[PDB]
């Protein structure tokens, strides 16, 4: 299948409570594999998936240098952005960055990503060309001009097409038994009357990986988008994910409703009904 690597950086100021915290986590698809936290007692890059543990001390030290350097640079960046928005030194602010590469099923680069946010809003992003920028506002334009002057895009491109795909492929091979295994959802339909004249049908999907899934109800073969209650896909804690979709139906019409499930781990989509 297709696979991606992402790193997620969060830098958070906290005036009066020390210097800004910097935390980085790395993922392959929906599997986290490293973390770094400047607030740790002894900050260092730590493994968070078994297949990354085989990397040698050189790797851990390299990561640790990178994240310690970022920790310092993001503190400067937070100072800079506070000033770009004329903000007081009183408030707490957050810079986020998410970046990485996507591979297609043949292992070739599909595209790179590099986006940043300030206080939860788009700030600046690298365009799909990996050569030009999109700035959200006049403050982000200052960053854009600074990064254009320093040929930053060229650095990002070199990483996204280079080390990013090379290391992602390495991880995919080292963790192939899990990273390249799709576990299908285990499914069932439950039934709970809500009154004499209505009942809830809930369609469950459990134990699936990766997180991407489509779960829908149909009535007489028509999608029930507006009438369906969907919960956000949620982690089980064992690598797998869970989701349900529910609809309230007239008592006695239960068999007119079908639950449909699509998932990478499924050869053919499922159609399920309540089975009293």
């Amino acid at each position: 299948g297709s696979h991606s690597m992402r790193y997620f950086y969060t830098a958070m100021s906290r005036p009066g409570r020390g210097e800004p915290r910097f935390i980085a986590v790395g993922y392959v698809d929906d599997t986290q594999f490293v973390r770094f936290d400047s607030d740790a007692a002894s900050p260092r890059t730590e493994p968070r998936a078994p297949w990354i543990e085989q990397e040698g001390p050189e790797y851990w030290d390299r990561n640790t240098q990178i994240f310690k350097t970022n920790t310092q640079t993001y503190r400067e960046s937070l100072r800079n952005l506070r000033g770009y928005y004329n903000q007081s030194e009183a408030g707490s602010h957050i810079i986020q960055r998410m970046y990485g590469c996507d591979l297609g099923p043949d292992g070739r680069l599909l595209r790179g990503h590099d986006q940043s946010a300030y206080d939860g809003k788009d700030y600046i992003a690298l365009n799909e060309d990996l050569s030009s920028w999109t700035a959200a506002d006049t403050a982000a334009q200052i960053t854009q001009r600074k990064w254009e002057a320093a040929r930053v895009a060229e650095q990002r491109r070199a990483y996204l097409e280079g080390l990013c795909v090379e290391w992602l492929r390495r991880y995919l091979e080292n963790g192939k038994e899990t990273l390249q295994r799709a576990d299908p959802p285990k499914t069932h339909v439950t039934h709970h009357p809500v009154s004499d004249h209505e009942a809830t049908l809930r369609c469950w999907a459990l134990g699936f990986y990766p997180a991407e899934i489509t779960l829908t109800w149909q009535r007489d073969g028509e999608d029930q988008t507006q009438d369906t209650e969907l919960v956000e896909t949620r982690p089980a804690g064992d690598r797998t994910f869970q989701k349900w979709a529910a609809v309230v139906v007239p008592s006695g019409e239960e068999q007119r409703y079908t639950c449909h499930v699509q998932h990478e781990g499924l050869p053919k989509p499922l159609t399920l009904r309540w089975e009293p």
Partner: peptide, 13 residues
């Protein structure tokens, strides 16, 4: 592996 970040080189926002 994250984007390399050579000491002193990193361009801030």
């Amino acid at each position: 592996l994250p984007e390399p970040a050579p000491q002193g080189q990193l361009t801030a926002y």
